Every structure is written in structure tokens, then in C-alpha cells.
Amino acid sequence: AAISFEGLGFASGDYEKGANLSGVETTENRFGSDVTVRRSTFSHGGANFDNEYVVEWGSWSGWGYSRDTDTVPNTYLNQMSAMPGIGAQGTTNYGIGYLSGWTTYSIDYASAFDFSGLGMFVTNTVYAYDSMLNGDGFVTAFTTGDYLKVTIEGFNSSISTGSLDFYLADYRSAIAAEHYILDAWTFLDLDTLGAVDELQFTLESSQSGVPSYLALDQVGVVPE
């Protein structure tokens, strides 16, 4: 029932960013270059995940998946690993979103899924975590005022069933003791969304240089 990502295959290595997904390719002009854009969708049960891969750049956006256990930071060369180096609830596979440009991306259900009594797991990627914690060429190391959050909104036939915020990293508080960055799979309660045919995800950050990723897993399970 739950989206576990299990029994999605790995054609190459320990993750899928879209380079080996089958999809539809068109030529588009982007940042001044004509490039080949592949739009693909992978499925897990009733749920559909859109992926966009630009062939010439090797860049991607939208959704991918992983079983990666490598937790050594190596900027974008290790971008598909969740901080725990394993999926949630001891499972091998998990999802990755590169929710590029701080806009909205969706999981599309063929049939309504009821989140009553249920939730999902999220955490940070190694790349994003390390960037926020320590800083890089694009990011000032997180201090008072910094944050990374995700808004999760349910829809049913394009009508909102409710909207929830959850902080992947919260340094906003004047009280330093309130500051944290998630390094573990963390349960997010989605009960109030009820029956949805679409879940929308949007990241927001104090700093636009923060790698716009989250790790997600076990979508639609009971609290443990």
C-alpha cells in the first residue's frame, strides 16, 4: 500500500537520477543552449513520479530514487544519499526529490489514497545537510534566521484537502536550543490530508544557494 520504493531497479550504480529512465526527448533552449530534455515517469504501485533529465548536461530535476549507503560528502557527486545511508524503517530503497527552483512538484495517484491515520518519512540528503551545516561556495553556514522547510499539500480533483509545513532544518529561533538539522528519518503526520489523488511538495529556504533536495520514504504508513 505504502510507497516504499522497493523493487525499483538500478541499471547503473546505487541510484537513479533519470539517466537510465525511458521517456520522451525534445530539444529546448535553456540558459542560452539547445539541449535534449527527457521527461520520464516512474511508478510505485498507484503513484507516479515525474523526472526531467537534460542529456548534454547530465542534470536532472523532479523525482528519483536510491539505495545509496555512501554518507561521505562530495557535493553533487554524492547527491542521492539520505543522511542515514539507508531507507526508513530499515528498508533498502528510498526517494529523492530535486525540487529545483523552489517551485512545486507532485506525486500523482491513479486512484485516491487515504492518508487518515498515516504519514511518511523525510530527512535531509548528505549533500544538503553538509551544505547547510558547514557552508560552501553558495551557502553561509546556518546561523540564527536560517531554515529549510517543505510544504506538503493534498489535492483531490484539484481541490486542496489541506496544507502542512515541516522544517528539515530550523535555525530561525533567537533561542539556540530550538535550532536543528534533521539527520534521521523523521515521521511526518499526514492524517489531516485525508483522501488525495495528488501530494504537492514545495521547498523553501532562508538561502537560495541551499541544495534544493529532500529525501522521502515509506509514504503512507502508520506511526511507530
Q: Binding site membership for cyanocob(III)alamin: which residues?
A: 57, 60, 98, 127, 136, 208-210, 212
76 binds ligand CNC (CB under 6 A): yes
Q: How far is the CB of 218 from Ca ion (least distance, A)?
A: 6
Give the span between the Cα atoms of 82 and 91, in whole angstroms.
Answer: 12
Residue 140, binding choice from ligand CNC, Ca ion, none, Cβ under 5 to 8 Å by partner class: none
Selected from 48, 59, 78, 91, the binder of Ca ion by CB under 5 A is 91
73 binds ligand CNC (CB under 6 A): no
Q: Which residues are annotated binding-site positions for Ca(2+)?
A: 4, 6, 91, 93, 217
Determine the interface stretch with Ca ion among 87-95, 141-149, 172-180, 181-189 (rule: CB under 5 A): 87-95
Q: Could you please report the per-residue DSSP string of the chain?
A: --B--TT---SSTTEESSTT--EEEEEEEETTEEEEEEEEEEEETTEEEEEEEETTTTEEEEEEEE-------BTBTT-S-BTTSS-GGG-S-EEEEE-GGG-EEEEEEEEEEE-TT-EEEEE-BHHHHHHHHH--SS-PPP-TTEEEEEEEEEEETTEEEEEEEEEEEEE--SSGGG-EE--S-EEEE-GGG-EEEEEEEEEEES-TTS--EEEEEEEEE---
97 binds ligand CNC (CB under 6 A): no
Q: How far is the CB of 28 from ligand CNC (least distance, A)?
A: 12
x/- mask, Ca ion, residues 198-217, rule CB under 5 A, reads: -------------------x
Residues 188-217 that bind ligand CNC (CB under 6 A): 208-212
Q: How far is the CB of 60 from ligand CNC (least distance, A)?
A: 5
Residue 4, binding choice from ligand CNC, Ca ion, none, Cβ under 5 to 8 Å by partner class: Ca ion
59 binds ligand CNC (CB under 6 A): yes
31 binds ligand CNC (CB under 6 A): yes
> Which of 23, 1, 216, 19 has the alpha carbon at shortest distance from 125?
216
